[PDB]
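Subject: sequence -> structure tokens, single chain

Hey, anyone have a minute? Need the predicted structure for the following. Not urgent.
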Amino acid sequence: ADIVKNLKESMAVLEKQKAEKATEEVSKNLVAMKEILYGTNTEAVAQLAQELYNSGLLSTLVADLQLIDFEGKKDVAQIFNNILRRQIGTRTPTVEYICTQQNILFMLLKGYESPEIALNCGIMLRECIRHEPLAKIILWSEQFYDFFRYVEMSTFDIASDAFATFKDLLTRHKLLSAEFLEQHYDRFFSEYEKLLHSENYVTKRQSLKLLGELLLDRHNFTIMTKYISKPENLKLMMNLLRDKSRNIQFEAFHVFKVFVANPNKTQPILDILLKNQAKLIEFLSKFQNDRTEDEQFNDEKTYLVKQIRDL
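Reply:
Had a minute. Here:
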């Protein structure tokens, strides 16, 4: 693959500070590689693989993102996600590759900090997370907690893009995810509490929704038992219940409804509910009654009311 090497040569030229001739070579080979890569997803022409991996192209394309023009950056993402999906027999060679070249993952993560390459970075990153091995390397790294900064990042676009990656990492692979959340409880949920206190509307919303999703998965049962035993967390759901915004309240309900539904509430949790019994009934009875379509919701409300009434 002359192409692989010309792209690397052509990119090394850009990497300094001719630019037109290289800027134009780079696009061209970017287009050629896209064009080669449109064929199928174990024969001696695994020499092409050995060649790709050896050349270090996949890092350079990621590391050099910023020297590349806007349509170029889409090509890179496309090229890259294409190489990462390919299978040789049962293995996924690129997955094993990046296991040995972890800085590819950490460069992609770090891209959310660059408004000019954020969105390409997330495209490549969500493609990596598809693979338990790379998700695992990202979950167990300290760089993971950068997501709490990025999701409140800047512009709407990026922040929503970071969150989707955030979300996927925490839900796609259940056993690994449950495992992360158990080993990192205090740290993770202290950081998550900060998100719940956010003044940003999209932030509380997304986080609330994800929270309830995290807590209702049977894989996270212990994470959950714990979380719903903390008076502090309950007061937080309850205060989110009176948020000026009907979408926040709705999401807070779904976290709230878990604290109450739990057959064994710790004494502190019980006591909170009882302290505010009358006020709870009065809230629930009036709470978003115009939402009639959602049967499960109506039922949940009607149950909490009895439970509470039944304390």
